[PDB]
Amino acid sequence: TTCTNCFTQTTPLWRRNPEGQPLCNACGLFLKLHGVVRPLSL
């Protein structure tokens, strides 16, 4: 499995977007707390 946001394939816990798509613990947790998708470099 992979994260729709950060594409990581390594994470302690997988989460799902309010639709059902896989997000990593961090990305999923970040959105849940702040309301927006976790922003990345580059």
Partner 1 sequence: QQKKTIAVVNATGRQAASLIRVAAAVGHHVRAQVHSLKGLIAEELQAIPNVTLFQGPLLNNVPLMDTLFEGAHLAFINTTSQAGDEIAIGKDLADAAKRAGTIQHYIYSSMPDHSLYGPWPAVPMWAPKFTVENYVRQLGLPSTFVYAGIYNNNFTSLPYPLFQMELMPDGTFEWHAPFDPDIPLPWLDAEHDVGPALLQIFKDGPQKWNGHRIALTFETLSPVQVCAAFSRALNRRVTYVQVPKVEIKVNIPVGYREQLEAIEVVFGEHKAPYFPLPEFSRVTDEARKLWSGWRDMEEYAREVFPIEEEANGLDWML
Which residues contact partner 1 (rule: CB under 8 A)? Answer: 8-11, 24-30, 33-42
Residue closer to partner 1, measured from CB, 20 or 35: 35
Q: Is 26 left (phi over 0), alpha (psi -120 to 50) or beta?
A: alpha
Residue closer to partner 1, measured from CB, 20 or 33: 33
Q: Which does 5 bind (CB under 5 to 8 A by kind): partner 1, Zn ion, none?
A: Zn ion
Q: What are the C-alpha distances in Å from 26 to residues 9, 39?
A: 12, 11
The reply on whether position 6 binds Zn ion by CB under 5 A is yes
